[PDB]
Design a protein around this ligand. Structure first.
Ligand SMILES: CN[C@@H]1CCc2c(ccc(O)c2O)[C@H]1O
Length: 279
Protein backbone atom coordinates (compact mmCIF):
# COMPACT_ATOMS: atom_id res chain seq x y z
CA UNK A 1 0.00 0.00 0.00
CA UNK A 2 2.17 2.82 1.32
CA UNK A 3 5.30 3.38 -0.77
CA UNK A 4 8.50 3.14 1.26
CA UNK A 5 10.66 4.15 -1.69
CA UNK A 6 11.07 7.74 -0.52
CA UNK A 7 14.32 6.86 1.26
CA UNK A 8 15.72 5.44 -1.97
CA UNK A 9 14.50 8.44 -3.98
CA UNK A 10 16.08 11.02 -1.66
CA UNK A 11 19.48 9.36 -2.09
CA UNK A 12 19.30 9.82 -5.87
CA UNK A 13 18.08 13.41 -5.46
CA UNK A 14 20.91 14.35 -3.09
CA UNK A 15 23.62 12.59 -5.12
CA UNK A 16 22.54 14.31 -8.33
CA UNK A 17 22.08 17.75 -6.74
CA UNK A 18 25.37 17.97 -4.86
CA UNK A 19 27.53 16.75 -7.73
CA UNK A 20 25.78 18.92 -10.32
CA UNK A 21 26.25 21.97 -8.10
CA UNK A 22 29.94 21.18 -7.57
CA UNK A 23 30.58 20.68 -11.29
CA UNK A 24 28.78 23.89 -12.25
CA UNK A 25 30.59 25.87 -9.55
CA UNK A 26 33.99 24.67 -10.77
CA UNK A 27 33.18 25.17 -14.45
CA UNK A 28 31.51 28.58 -14.41
CA UNK A 29 33.84 30.45 -12.02
CA UNK A 30 37.41 30.89 -13.26
CA UNK A 31 38.77 31.65 -9.77
CA UNK A 32 38.41 27.97 -8.78
CA UNK A 33 40.32 26.34 -11.67
CA UNK A 34 43.32 24.73 -9.97
CA UNK A 35 45.39 21.57 -10.43
CA UNK A 36 44.04 20.15 -7.17
CA UNK A 37 40.50 20.83 -8.42
CA UNK A 38 40.73 18.51 -11.44
CA UNK A 39 40.77 15.42 -9.23
CA UNK A 40 37.67 16.76 -7.47
CA UNK A 41 36.06 17.15 -10.89
CA UNK A 42 36.84 13.51 -11.75
CA UNK A 43 35.46 12.31 -8.40
CA UNK A 44 32.30 14.38 -8.89
CA UNK A 45 31.86 12.91 -12.38
CA UNK A 46 32.12 9.37 -10.99
CA UNK A 47 29.61 10.13 -8.24
CA UNK A 48 27.20 11.68 -10.78
CA UNK A 49 26.95 8.64 -13.03
CA UNK A 50 26.15 6.48 -10.06
CA UNK A 51 23.22 8.48 -8.88
CA UNK A 52 21.78 8.70 -12.35
CA UNK A 53 22.35 5.13 -13.54
CA UNK A 54 22.99 2.60 -10.78
CA UNK A 55 20.85 3.58 -7.90
CA UNK A 56 17.73 4.14 -9.96
CA UNK A 57 17.91 0.67 -11.59
CA UNK A 58 18.99 -1.03 -8.39
CA UNK A 59 15.95 0.20 -6.55
CA UNK A 60 13.60 -1.18 -9.14
CA UNK A 61 15.22 -4.60 -8.72
CA UNK A 62 14.68 -4.41 -4.99
CA UNK A 63 11.18 -3.00 -5.16
CA UNK A 64 9.73 -4.79 -8.19
CA UNK A 65 11.71 -7.97 -7.26
CA UNK A 66 12.13 -8.75 -10.99
CA UNK A 67 14.48 -7.52 -13.71
CA UNK A 68 12.20 -6.59 -16.60
CA UNK A 69 15.06 -5.74 -18.96
CA UNK A 70 17.38 -8.15 -20.72
CA UNK A 71 20.48 -10.03 -19.62
CA UNK A 72 22.76 -7.80 -21.71
CA UNK A 73 21.47 -4.88 -19.64
CA UNK A 74 22.43 -6.79 -16.48
CA UNK A 75 25.98 -7.21 -17.76
CA UNK A 76 26.19 -3.55 -18.80
CA UNK A 77 24.82 -2.33 -15.45
CA UNK A 78 27.21 -4.51 -13.44
CA UNK A 79 30.13 -3.24 -15.52
CA UNK A 80 29.15 0.39 -14.92
CA UNK A 81 28.78 -0.25 -11.18
CA UNK A 82 32.25 -1.78 -10.83
CA UNK A 83 33.83 0.89 -13.04
CA UNK A 84 32.39 3.79 -11.06
CA UNK A 85 33.24 2.32 -7.65
CA UNK A 86 36.87 1.62 -8.50
CA UNK A 87 37.29 4.99 -10.25
CA UNK A 88 35.98 6.89 -7.23
CA UNK A 89 38.22 5.06 -4.76
CA UNK A 90 41.33 5.51 -6.92
CA UNK A 91 40.52 9.21 -7.30
CA UNK A 92 40.41 9.52 -3.51
CA UNK A 93 43.83 7.84 -3.31
CA UNK A 94 45.21 10.26 -5.92
CA UNK A 95 43.91 13.24 -3.93
CA UNK A 96 45.61 11.95 -0.78
CA UNK A 97 48.94 11.44 -2.57
CA UNK A 98 48.69 14.93 -4.08
CA UNK A 99 48.26 16.46 -0.62
CA UNK A 100 51.23 14.43 0.63
CA UNK A 101 53.46 15.71 -2.17
CA UNK A 102 52.24 19.26 -1.57
CA UNK A 103 52.99 19.27 2.16
CA UNK A 104 56.12 17.12 2.40
CA UNK A 105 58.23 18.84 -0.30
CA UNK A 106 57.05 22.44 -0.80
CA UNK A 107 59.93 23.71 -2.95
CA UNK A 108 59.55 21.04 -5.65
CA UNK A 109 55.74 20.84 -5.58
CA UNK A 110 55.24 23.17 -8.55
CA UNK A 111 57.50 21.14 -10.86
CA UNK A 112 56.17 17.78 -9.67
CA UNK A 113 52.51 18.56 -10.42
CA UNK A 114 51.65 20.55 -13.54
CA UNK A 115 48.37 20.99 -15.43
CA UNK A 116 49.66 18.65 -18.14
CA UNK A 117 50.63 15.74 -15.87
CA UNK A 118 47.33 15.72 -13.97
CA UNK A 119 45.56 15.01 -17.26
CA UNK A 120 47.68 11.91 -17.87
CA UNK A 121 47.20 10.74 -14.28
CA UNK A 122 43.41 11.03 -14.53
CA UNK A 123 43.34 9.25 -17.89
CA UNK A 124 45.50 6.43 -16.52
CA UNK A 125 43.19 6.06 -13.52
CA UNK A 126 40.11 5.84 -15.73
CA UNK A 127 41.75 3.36 -18.12
CA UNK A 128 42.79 1.12 -15.22
CA UNK A 129 39.25 1.33 -13.86
CA UNK A 130 37.80 0.39 -17.25
CA UNK A 131 40.11 -2.60 -17.67
CA UNK A 132 39.04 -4.05 -14.31
CA UNK A 133 35.28 -3.76 -14.93
CA UNK A 134 34.25 -4.00 -18.59
CA UNK A 135 36.83 -6.44 -19.98
CA UNK A 136 36.30 -9.36 -17.54
CA UNK A 137 32.51 -9.06 -17.26
CA UNK A 138 31.86 -8.50 -20.97
CA UNK A 139 34.11 -11.43 -21.87
CA UNK A 140 32.30 -13.69 -19.35
CA UNK A 141 35.44 -14.56 -17.37
CA UNK A 142 34.01 -13.88 -13.90
CA UNK A 143 31.14 -16.38 -14.10
CA UNK A 144 30.93 -19.25 -11.60
CA UNK A 145 30.34 -22.96 -12.16
CA UNK A 146 27.76 -24.11 -9.59
CA UNK A 147 24.21 -24.93 -10.64
CA UNK A 148 22.41 -21.91 -9.15
CA UNK A 149 24.58 -19.47 -11.11
CA UNK A 150 23.92 -21.37 -14.35
CA UNK A 151 20.16 -21.35 -13.74
CA UNK A 152 20.30 -17.61 -12.98
CA UNK A 153 22.26 -16.94 -16.18
CA UNK A 154 19.87 -18.99 -18.33
CA UNK A 155 16.75 -17.10 -17.21
CA UNK A 156 16.33 -13.69 -18.83
CA UNK A 157 14.06 -12.38 -16.04
CA UNK A 158 16.26 -12.79 -12.94
CA UNK A 159 19.39 -10.71 -12.31
CA UNK A 160 21.75 -11.71 -9.49
CA UNK A 161 25.50 -11.45 -8.90
CA UNK A 162 27.58 -14.64 -8.88
CA UNK A 163 31.38 -14.69 -9.12
CA UNK A 164 34.30 -17.06 -8.64
CA UNK A 165 37.24 -16.86 -6.26
CA UNK A 166 39.93 -15.39 -8.50
CA UNK A 167 37.87 -12.48 -9.81
CA UNK A 168 36.52 -11.59 -6.36
CA UNK A 169 39.96 -11.58 -4.74
CA UNK A 170 41.67 -9.65 -7.55
CA UNK A 171 38.83 -7.13 -7.83
CA UNK A 172 38.87 -6.44 -4.09
CA UNK A 173 42.66 -6.08 -4.09
CA UNK A 174 42.64 -3.62 -7.00
CA UNK A 175 39.63 -1.60 -5.83
CA UNK A 176 40.14 -1.22 -2.09
CA UNK A 177 43.23 -2.54 -0.27
CA UNK A 178 46.23 -0.96 -2.03
CA UNK A 179 44.58 2.51 -2.00
CA UNK A 180 43.75 2.01 1.68
CA UNK A 181 47.38 1.27 2.55
CA UNK A 182 48.59 4.21 0.48
CA UNK A 183 46.18 6.65 2.15
CA UNK A 184 47.10 5.35 5.61
CA UNK A 185 50.81 5.98 5.00
CA UNK A 186 50.12 9.39 3.45
CA UNK A 187 47.98 10.65 6.29
CA UNK A 188 50.30 9.35 9.01
CA UNK A 189 53.17 11.29 7.41
CA UNK A 190 51.03 14.43 7.10
CA UNK A 191 49.99 14.19 10.75
CA UNK A 192 53.62 13.83 11.85
CA UNK A 193 54.63 16.94 9.89
CA UNK A 194 51.72 18.94 11.33
CA UNK A 195 52.59 17.92 14.89
CA UNK A 196 56.22 18.95 14.36
CA UNK A 197 55.14 22.37 13.08
CA UNK A 198 52.79 22.86 16.04
CA UNK A 199 55.50 22.00 18.57
CA UNK A 200 57.90 24.38 16.81
CA UNK A 201 55.39 27.24 17.04
CA UNK A 202 54.76 26.45 20.72
CA UNK A 203 58.49 26.48 21.47
CA UNK A 204 58.80 29.78 19.61
CA UNK A 205 55.94 31.88 21.07
CA UNK A 206 56.79 31.98 24.76
CA UNK A 207 53.93 34.32 25.65
CA UNK A 208 43.17 19.14 17.64
CA UNK A 209 42.04 20.60 14.32
CA UNK A 210 44.34 18.31 12.32
CA UNK A 211 43.16 15.29 14.31
CA UNK A 212 39.51 16.20 13.69
CA UNK A 213 40.03 16.72 9.95
CA UNK A 214 42.02 13.50 9.50
CA UNK A 215 39.48 11.61 11.58
CA UNK A 216 36.61 12.81 9.41
CA UNK A 217 38.45 12.06 6.15
CA UNK A 218 39.67 8.59 7.08
CA UNK A 219 36.70 7.48 9.16
CA UNK A 220 33.98 8.25 6.63
CA UNK A 221 35.79 6.26 3.92
CA UNK A 222 36.68 3.34 6.20
CA UNK A 223 33.21 3.03 7.73
CA UNK A 224 31.55 3.34 4.32
CA UNK A 225 33.64 0.86 2.34
CA UNK A 226 35.59 -1.44 4.70
CA UNK A 227 32.67 -3.66 5.89
CA UNK A 228 31.57 -4.55 2.35
CA UNK A 229 34.90 -5.84 1.04
CA UNK A 230 35.42 -8.15 4.02
CA UNK A 231 32.15 -9.95 3.29
CA UNK A 232 33.02 -9.81 -0.42
CA UNK A 233 36.12 -11.87 0.34
CA UNK A 234 34.40 -14.10 2.90
CA UNK A 235 31.27 -15.13 0.98
CA UNK A 236 33.32 -16.92 -1.69
CA UNK A 237 35.30 -18.99 0.82
CA UNK A 238 32.27 -20.01 2.91
CA UNK A 239 29.08 -20.19 0.85
CA UNK A 240 26.66 -20.70 3.75
CA UNK A 241 28.32 -18.15 6.04
CA UNK A 242 26.72 -14.94 4.74
CA UNK A 243 23.17 -14.52 3.46
CA UNK A 244 22.30 -12.39 0.44
CA UNK A 245 20.25 -9.67 2.16
CA UNK A 246 23.29 -8.67 4.22
CA UNK A 247 25.30 -8.45 0.99
CA UNK A 248 22.78 -6.11 -0.65
CA UNK A 249 22.39 -4.01 2.51
CA UNK A 250 26.15 -3.52 2.91
CA UNK A 251 26.55 -2.76 -0.80
CA UNK A 252 23.86 -0.08 -0.55
CA UNK A 253 25.54 1.32 2.57
CA UNK A 254 28.65 1.68 0.42
CA UNK A 255 26.76 3.65 -2.24
CA UNK A 256 25.82 6.44 0.19
CA UNK A 257 29.46 7.57 0.37
CA UNK A 258 29.06 9.12 -3.09
CA UNK A 259 26.69 11.80 -1.79
CA UNK A 260 28.96 12.87 1.08
CA UNK A 261 32.01 13.88 -0.99
CA UNK A 262 31.03 17.59 -1.32
CA UNK A 263 30.69 17.76 2.48
CA UNK A 264 34.27 16.58 3.05
CA UNK A 265 36.36 17.92 0.13
CA UNK A 266 34.37 20.73 -1.51
CA UNK A 267 33.62 23.14 1.37
CA UNK A 268 36.11 25.99 1.89
CA UNK A 269 35.78 29.78 1.81
CA UNK A 270 36.27 30.09 -1.96
CA UNK A 271 33.79 27.28 -2.64
CA UNK A 272 31.29 28.90 -0.27
CA UNK A 273 31.69 32.22 -2.09
CA UNK A 274 31.08 30.42 -5.39
CA UNK A 275 28.03 28.58 -4.05
CA UNK A 276 26.53 31.82 -2.72
CA UNK A 277 26.16 33.43 -6.15
CA UNK A 278 24.58 30.48 -7.98
CA UNK A 279 21.65 29.88 -5.63
C1 LIG B 1 26.90 -5.31 -8.13
N1 LIG B 1 27.71 -5.21 -6.91
C2 LIG B 1 29.18 -5.26 -7.11
C3 LIG B 1 29.74 -6.68 -6.85
C4 LIG B 1 31.29 -6.79 -6.79
C5 LIG B 1 32.11 -5.49 -6.70
C6 LIG B 1 31.47 -4.26 -6.43
C7 LIG B 1 32.28 -3.11 -6.36
C8 LIG B 1 33.65 -3.14 -6.55
C9 LIG B 1 34.33 -4.34 -6.82
O1 LIG B 1 35.65 -4.42 -7.01
C10 LIG B 1 33.53 -5.54 -6.90
O2 LIG B 1 34.13 -6.70 -7.15
C11 LIG B 1 29.94 -4.22 -6.22
O3 LIG B 1 29.46 -2.96 -6.56
Amino acid sequence: VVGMGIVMSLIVLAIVFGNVLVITAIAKFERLQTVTNYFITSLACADLVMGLAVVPFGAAHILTKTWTFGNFWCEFWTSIDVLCVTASIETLCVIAVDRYFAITSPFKYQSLLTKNKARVIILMVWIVSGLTSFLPIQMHWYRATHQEAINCYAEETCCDFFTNQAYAIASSIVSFYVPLVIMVFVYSRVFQEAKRQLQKIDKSEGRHKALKTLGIIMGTFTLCWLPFFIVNIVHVIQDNLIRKEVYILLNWIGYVNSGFNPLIYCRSPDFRIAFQELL
